[model samples]
Every structure is written in C-alpha cells, then in structure tokens.
Target: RVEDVMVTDVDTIDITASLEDVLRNYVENAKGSSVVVKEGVRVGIVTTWDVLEAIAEGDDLAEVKVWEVMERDLVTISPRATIKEAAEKMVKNVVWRLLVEEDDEIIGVISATDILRAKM
Candidate 1:
C-alpha cells in the first residue's frame, strides 16, 4: 500500500518564504522538502535541490522567494494503491514524488527516493 511507503508527517511552508527559510525547513524537518502554499492555496512544492539550483545561479537564498523556484502542479494518489501504481503515478506526473490522498484525507508523500529503498 502507498501508506506503507508514504511519509505521513509532512510539512508545508509559505510561498513568500526565502530560500534560506526553505533550507531551514530541510534541516528542521529532515524531509529536505515540503509543500508551498499561499492563503491556504497550494502553489507548488519545493526542495533543497531547488535551493541548490538557485544558489548555483547566484541567487541569494534570502532574496529569492519560494514562488520564484517552486514547481507547480502535483498528482495525487490513493493510500490503497499498489507500489507499482505509486511509481506509475510518479512516472505519469513526471515527478519524483506524489501526494497521497484517501477520500480527501491528505495522508503523505511517496517517492522513488522513499520507495526504492523502503519497498525493495
């Protein structure tokens, strides 16, 4: 099941935040990433990997806002889905991770990073 591999204790951050704030989230929560929202509206998702790209381009972590580098759109899957289905969702959405939802309940996240080691 997706829940078997999903990260239940997910965290989120504001869209107006800085890359430094995003970096802080990685060290703070240990996910190295989180959802981005504004006024309770999901704008996108972010990760420290994005921070690296921004920094490599000389963008100050403190100066660049989350919305600047955040990626829009996420594909959601059911907690009851098979591991292969989870991987398919990632492949279908062209993302490493997928949101796990069950009857509108936001359960957690599932990704190749989590699935490969956790499932295999």
Candidate 2:
C-alpha cells in the first residue's frame, strides 16, 4: 500500500528560499527532493537534479530562488491509491515522485525508490 511506504517526514523549504539554502538543506537531510511551499500552501517541487540543472545552466544558485527553478507541474495521488496505480501514474507522468494528498492536505510523499522497496 502507498500509505505504508510513503515518506511522512517530507523535506520542505520556503518558496522564497535561495537555491544555495535549499541545496545546503538537501545535503544535510539527503532527502533528494523538497516540497516548495508559499504562504503555507504547496506551490511546487524541487529535486537535486533541478538544482544541478540550474548550475549546469551557469546560473548562480545563491541568486536563484526555489520558486524560480522548481517544477510547478505537480503530479499527485491519493493516499489510498494502490502501489500499482501509483507506479502507473509515475510512469505515465515521467516523474520520480508523487505528492499524496488527503482532504486537500499533503500528508506524505512517495518516490520511485519507495515503490521499489515496497516491492522488494
């Protein structure tokens, strides 16, 4: 079940946080990704790859904000959604993670690695 494997202790950062700050937090937490929130509302998602891409673009991360490089196109699934369904959605959307929402609130997050562990 997704509820069983989803990561409840999600990493999050303020939408206005600088890329340098986000990357620093990421290295400390090693969570691979972070949810970007603005005014207590989830607005976007940012991954290690996103930061790396920005750096690759020759952009100064210290001057960039999370919202500037975060992916606003969110892919979400219900907490009750089956593992198979979750995987299917991931594949369909070409994403590595999915935000789990219940009653209009994000409760957890599930990643491809989490799915692999669940199958194992």
Candidate 3:
C-alpha cells in the first residue's frame, strides 16, 4: 500500500519561487522534486527533468519562475493501492513519482526508489 511506504514528510516550495530557488531547495534536501504550494497548499510539482527541458528551451533558470517549469499534469495515485499497482501507474504514465490523493486532498508521494525499497 502507498501509505505504508509513501514519503509522508513531503517538502513544498512557494509557487511563486524561481527555478534557481527550486534548485537550491534541492541542495538543501537533494530530493528529486518539490511539491509546489501556495499559502501552504500543494499545487504542482517540479523535477530535475523539468528544469532540463526549460534549459533546453533557453530560459534562464535564475529568471524563470518555478511555475513556468513545474509539471502540472500530476499523475495521482491512491495511497491504499498496492506498490505493484502504483509501479504500473508510474510505468504507464512515464512518471517517476505519484502524488497521493485521498479523501479529497494530497497526502503523500511515492517515487521509483521508494517503490524499490519495498523489496524483501
């Protein structure tokens, strides 16, 4: 189940923050992504690849806003679903992590590495 292994200590960054800020935030934790939030409400996600794409687009990381590169097409998953099922969702959508949504709110997240840790 996602709740069993999902990362509950989710870290969020300000929605209005810049790409540079997002990069620095990662340096603070080295987490692969950041949950975008506004006034403490989770809104979107930004990952390393997202920044890479923006760089390919010739956007200045320091000048561009995180929202501009944040991936909004969130692939949500159920926290109660089996980890195997969650992996399927991840593989099918080409997503490395899934934002867990339950009871009408985001609760936790599970990434590829997190899934592997479920191994015996």
Candidate 4:
C-alpha cells in the first residue's frame, strides 16, 4: 500500500552540499526534506526542521555542510510494506518520511501526508 501511494519524485542533495544550497533546493522544490547522498549513495536526510535547528544554533548556513546537520540514522522500509506498518515506523522513529527501498535501492519516498491521503 505504501508503494501505491509513495512519491517517486523524491529529491536528493549531495552530502557535501552547503546548508544554504540545501535550503534553496528545498524551497525551490517545495519539499519538507531531501535525502542526503554521498558518492551517489544515500547516507542521511536533511529536513526543514534540521535547517531551522542549525539556524537557531547560529550555524553559518553558507559554511556548514549538509552532512554535518543531517539525520544520519536513516529510517527505511521496503516498497511492499503496508501503510499501517509505514505509519508505525514513522511514529516509532518520530520521522515524517521513510525511504522506500526495493532490492537495496531507494525507489521512492512515503511521508505522513501520503498516509493521510490514503486514509481519506
């Protein structure tokens, strides 16, 4: 069910990218978060809240790297996972989104919004 509602147009940014650039990308795409990648592999996630926290802490957005503030402990699930299971994982982890994997590759992303839509 998650696969059926997951968004395939997931956004990503390089791990080495500047925090300013990441914020700009997120704004331009109207995304709440993006997957952090290194050497073309997913490594972490940067979210709007993460950026806010950095700013709140007075970190220089132009100088700080994405990886420095990203959530490194990624919470992932398979495409075949049920919507209920996805919701449970999100609640358990206190995360808004989950990387959807298939064959060890992230194929899409499912968020709390997607689950709400499914409920409707």
CA-lDDT, candidates in order:
0.79, 0.83, 0.81, 0.84
After best superposition, candidate 4 residue 63: deviation in angstroms? 2.4
Model 2 pairs whose backbones collide: none
Please write out the lDDT profile of model 4 over residues 15-76, one tens digit for every residue. Answer: 88888887787788776888888898977778887778778999989898888887744578
lDDT of 1 by residue, 51-110 (tens): 889878988799998888887445678888998988887888777877777666556777
Summing lDDT over every window of 10 consecutive residues in candidate 1, give the lowest-scoring window: 99-108
What ordering of candidates by lDDT runs from best to worst?
4, 2, 3, 1
Better of 1 and 2 by TM-score: 2
lDDT of 3 by residue, 66-90 (tens): 7777664447888989999989999
Candidate 3 stretches with Cα past 4 Å from truth are none
Runs in model 4 lying further than 4 Å from the true structure: 72-74
TM-score: model 1 vs. ground truth:
0.71
Of 1 and 3, which scores higher on TM-score?
3
- Report the C-alpha lDDT of model 2 over 76-98, residue by residue, as the tens digit: 88889899999999999888998
* Superposed Cα deviation of residue 119, candidate 2 (Å): 0.3
